[PDB]
Amino acid sequence: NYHLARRRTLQVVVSSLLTEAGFESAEKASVETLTEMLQSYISEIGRSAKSYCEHTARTQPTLSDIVVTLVEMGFNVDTLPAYAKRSQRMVITXXXXXXXXXXXXXXXXXXXXXXXXXXXXXXXXXXXXXXXXXXXXXXXXXXXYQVLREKAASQRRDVERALTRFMAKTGETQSLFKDDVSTFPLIAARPFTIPYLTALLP
Amino acid sequence: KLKLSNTVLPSESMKVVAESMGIAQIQEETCQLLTDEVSYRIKEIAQDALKFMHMGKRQKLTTSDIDYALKLXXXXXXXXXXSVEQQLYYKEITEACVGSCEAKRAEALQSIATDPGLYQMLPRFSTFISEGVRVNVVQNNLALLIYLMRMVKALMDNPTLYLEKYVHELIPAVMTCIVSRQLCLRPDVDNHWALRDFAARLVAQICKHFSTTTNNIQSRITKTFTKSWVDEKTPWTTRYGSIAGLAELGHDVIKTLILPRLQQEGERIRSVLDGPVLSNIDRIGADHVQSLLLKHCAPVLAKLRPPPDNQDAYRAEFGSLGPLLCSQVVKARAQAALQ
Numbered sequence: 001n002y003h004l005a006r007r008r009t010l011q012v013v014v015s016s017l018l019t020e021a022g023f024e025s026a027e028k029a030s031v032e033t034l035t036e037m038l039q040s041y042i043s044e045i046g047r048s049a050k051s052y053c054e055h056t057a058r059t060q061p062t063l064s065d066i067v068v069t070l071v072e073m074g075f076n077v078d079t080l081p082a083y084a085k086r087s088q089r090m091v092i093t094x095x096x097x098x099x100x101x102x103x104x105x106x107x108x109x110x111x112x113x114x115x116x117x118x119x120x121x122x123x124x125x126x127x128x129x130x131x132x133x134x135x136x137x138x139x140x141x142x143x144x145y146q147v148l149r150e151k152a153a154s155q156r157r158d159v160e161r162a163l164t165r166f167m168a169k170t171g172e173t174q175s176l177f178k179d180d181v182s183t184f185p186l187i188a189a190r191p192f193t194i195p196y197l198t199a200l201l202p
Numbered sequence: 203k204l205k206l207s208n209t210v211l212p213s214e215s216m217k218v219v220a221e222s223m224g225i226a227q228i229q230e231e232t233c234q235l236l237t238d239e240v241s242y243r244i245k246e247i248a249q250d251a252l253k254f255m256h257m258g259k260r261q262k263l264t265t266s267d268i269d270y271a272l273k274l275x276x277x278x279x280x281x282x283x284x285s286v287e288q289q290l291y292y293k294e295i296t297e298a299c300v301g302s303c304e305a306k307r308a309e310a311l312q313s314i315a316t317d318p319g320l321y322q323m324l325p326r327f328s329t330f331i332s333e334g335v336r337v338n339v340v341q342n343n344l345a346l347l348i349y350l351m352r353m354v355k356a357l358m359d360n361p362t363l364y365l366e367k368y369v370h371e372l373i374p375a376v377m378t379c380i381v382s383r384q385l386c387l388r389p390d391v392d393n394h395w396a397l398r399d400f401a402a403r404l405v406a407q408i409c410k411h412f413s414t415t416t417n418n419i420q421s422r423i424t425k426t427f428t429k430s431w432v433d434e435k436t437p438w439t440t441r442y443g444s445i446a447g448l449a450e451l452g453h454d455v456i457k458t459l460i461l462p463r464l465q466q467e468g469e470r471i472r473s474v475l476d477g478p479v480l481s482n483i484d485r486i487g488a489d490h491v492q493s494l495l496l497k498h499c500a501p502v503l504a505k506l507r508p509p510p511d512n513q514d515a516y517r518a519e520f521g522s523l524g525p526l527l528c529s530q531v532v533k534a535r536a537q538a539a540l541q
Binding site for chain 1: 280284285286291294305308312317
């Protein structure tokens with residue numbers, strides 16, 4: 001796709017030479033076909049001079065080389081100064097266009113860790129660890145001794161008071177004040193038949 | 203498993219092309235075998251240009267290729283989704299989102315927008331990003347706001363990381379950034395308007411991708427801003443964020459919406475302007491808001507109406523738009539003359 005603009009630039013040169021001629025209208029496909037003919041004529045010059053100045057062992061095609069090329073390719077060069085009166089003096093030169101840029105970026109992690117490790121070659125760029133390598137997650141140490149046994153004993157106290165509240169509101173209840181179902185609802189007495197088998201039983 | 207019959211041109215068309223030069227009265231089998239022969243040479247050359255481009259090693263065939271062809275029991279403890287490495291990379295991401303050095307800022311922004319295949323320092327990242335949004339909405343701090351909103355922008359342009367499944371804890375943080383009460387200081391509400399502009403711009407970047415489905419995007423955000431615009435006795439930050447979000451939805455959106463809201467919001471203008479005794483915070487706020495949304499709404503009716511009869515167009519727009527609407531129409535005519 002991106003090649004095409006030079007070809008349409010040649011089409012602009014075609015339109016410039018038609019303007020110097022003075023055609024008001026044209027046939028578009030014929031115009032572009034003539035443009036193709038023009039670029040093939042350019043390349044025909046280039047092939048001719050290419051294989052022609054390889055007849056020297058050195059390369060560089062000079063002026064008289066191209067003179068003999070164009071006379072070989074059929075042109076009276078004597079009109080070339082006079083056509084200068086038409087060419088660079090009656091048609092305005094069009095300018096080229098090429099908009100190239102190199103954008104900026106930054107992705108700074110901090111990990112290389114192997115510059116030229118064992119396959120040593122100091123022409124590379126190690127990416128990171130943030131993409132290539134990986135690791136392992138255990139993520140739960142929690143080993144704070146006194147804090148641990150605080151957790152356990154506090155939880156034991158919780159289960160104490162929980163079962164206390166449960167059988168507090170469950171069974172026969174007698175209080176400390178009057179009507180403490182909220183604060184202190186002590187379980188009332190069972191008294192049962194055989195005390196010793198119960199109270200002396202590990 | 204395959205049959206390659208001869209692609210043979212209809213010989214009557216070939217006689218039409220022939221007798222276009224005016225040759226003779228032609229029999230069929232002549233042109234039939236002619237199409238055969240030319241098809242042989244064409245398909246031979248077609249194999250040949252294939253041999254070209256299967257050593258030039260592209261599967262597309264140009265004109266130039268054929269031009270060169272014409273040279274003829276307790277369970278194990280868990281492990282997170284992260285690595286330790288990439289979660290520390292994530293911590294770098296976060297503290298560069300904090301980052302005072304704008305080089306570190308832009309580094310973070312590029313690192314967001316161009317780490318495709320990351321995908322796994324996704325939602326956890328974005329999730330208590332949104333939680334930090336809520337907490338700093340409470341803290342009411344514009345710097346964290348602009349950092350997170352440009353962060354969401356860079357999230358929106360990292361093309362591989364598809365938003366769909368993880369949309370629905372992000373967009374409400376954006377709209378909470380839109381709505382109200384971004385009040386660091388009362389003389390410093392100025393940057394918050396640009397924050398709302400940038401936010402509604404982000405919503406505009408959202409809306410072009412997701413409302414094909416379930417219409418949470420278009421229908422819910424439009425009706426949100428609709429009934430939000432209906433909400434009387436609200437601070438004008440709400441009004442600005444609503445109308446700016448509707449502005450970012452598009453030309454025809456505003457063509458629907460600010461067709462009655464032209465003169466209805468002009469009634470809101472001259473309720474504000476030539477209005478109260480003194481509340482200059484709200485006066486200057488709502489005044490520049492109305493001015494901004496006026497000349498930002500202006501290209502719709504500029505594209506809609508021709509720029510004639512500015513005295514009548516002010517009557518067609520409740521006066522207060524005139525001639526700032528007419529000045530914006532002059533600016534639009536200048537922008538058209540730039541073309």
